């Protein structure tokens, strides 16, 4: 009763790309070489749950890993996953128009260094301000970065965090 | 490895219908208040194992309910179930064009009776000598009957038997 409505999803594969498509949702992945999300576009957020009969590879998944969350309607699939990533919780769900994609934010950087931050509140590329931070690190998560395309900006994924900036200066996500 | 070659697997859902098909197979399911197989058009039989990343609904499945074997390169899904009938391991597999339908032959008809034969091999509705059996029954199937449709006649389902038959006229696949 807590599902979405199927009478307008629509999920394929064909191949080496997959789609998880909705109204308002568009989440594809791809297989290089495994399945993994590539990017997702959502207009309408909701808060139904995405029904297994309109999911691919719905077996062995663990809801730490989905990307998007099972409970924004986040397909429950091996598709909507990313190695060295985990559920974005606390990601910028409060704007209307979101791009989910893997790429850097423009003029940034993001680099592999077990001494960093540990996964906190989704951050902004840019200082209330408005001034680019052109330092992140990683501790675990791969590369390209997982990245938050918004009206208000770009902005980086959990496991992502800036290098020798205060990270209260900054703007951060308050959505769980 | 030991699954098929997922470059030419295509499988979609848009609403109440789904399909999961490949070069030989085109496998059809429909929703009516609960997911189910449709039918099926199977035109070269392989042994390999249908991805997972290709597949719908692949929770809480046991293989003893999936229509096509997993064998036989048989979706692990819930789309690949219907209600009473259980794996059709000893059908007519040796066929190289096969359609599975429900619905039954054209001379016969099938009856609801607990009071009838147990699981055997799938049985032609035709006698060696060609005629046909009009009379089957059913002790947990459910109608309309699970039928094959082959280039030599029509096959019905491992629950479905017959009454009046001396169990030596009949045609009795020998493949599993």
Redesign the interface.
């Known amino acids: 009763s807590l599902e979405c409505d199927?009478?307008?999803?629509?999920?394929?594969?064909?191949?080496?790309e997959?789609v998880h498509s909705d109204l308002g949702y568009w989440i594809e992945s791809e297989?290089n070489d495994t399945?993994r999300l590539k990017r997702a576009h959502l207009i309408e957020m909701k808060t139904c749950e995405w029904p297994?009969?309109?999911?691919?590879?719905?077996?062995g998944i663990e809801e730490s890993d989905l990307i998007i969350p099972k409970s924004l309607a986040g397909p429950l699939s091996?598709?909507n996953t990313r190695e060295g990533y985990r559920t974005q919780m606390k990601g910028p769900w409060h704007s209307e128009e979101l791009e989910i994609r893997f790429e850097e934010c423009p003029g940034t950087k993001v680099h592999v260094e077990e001494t960093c931050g540990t996964r906190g509140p989704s951050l902004r590329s840019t200082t209330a301000s408005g001034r680019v931070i052109e330092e992140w690190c990683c501790r675990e998560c791969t590369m390209p970065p997982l990245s938050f395309r918004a009206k208000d900006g770009c902005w980086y994924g959990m496991e992502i965090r800036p290098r020798k900036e205060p990270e209260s200066n900054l703007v951060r996500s308050m959505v769980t």
């Open positions: 199927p009478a307008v999803i629509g999920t394929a594969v064909k191949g080496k997959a297989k399945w297994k009969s309109h999911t691919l590879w719905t077996d091996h598709h």
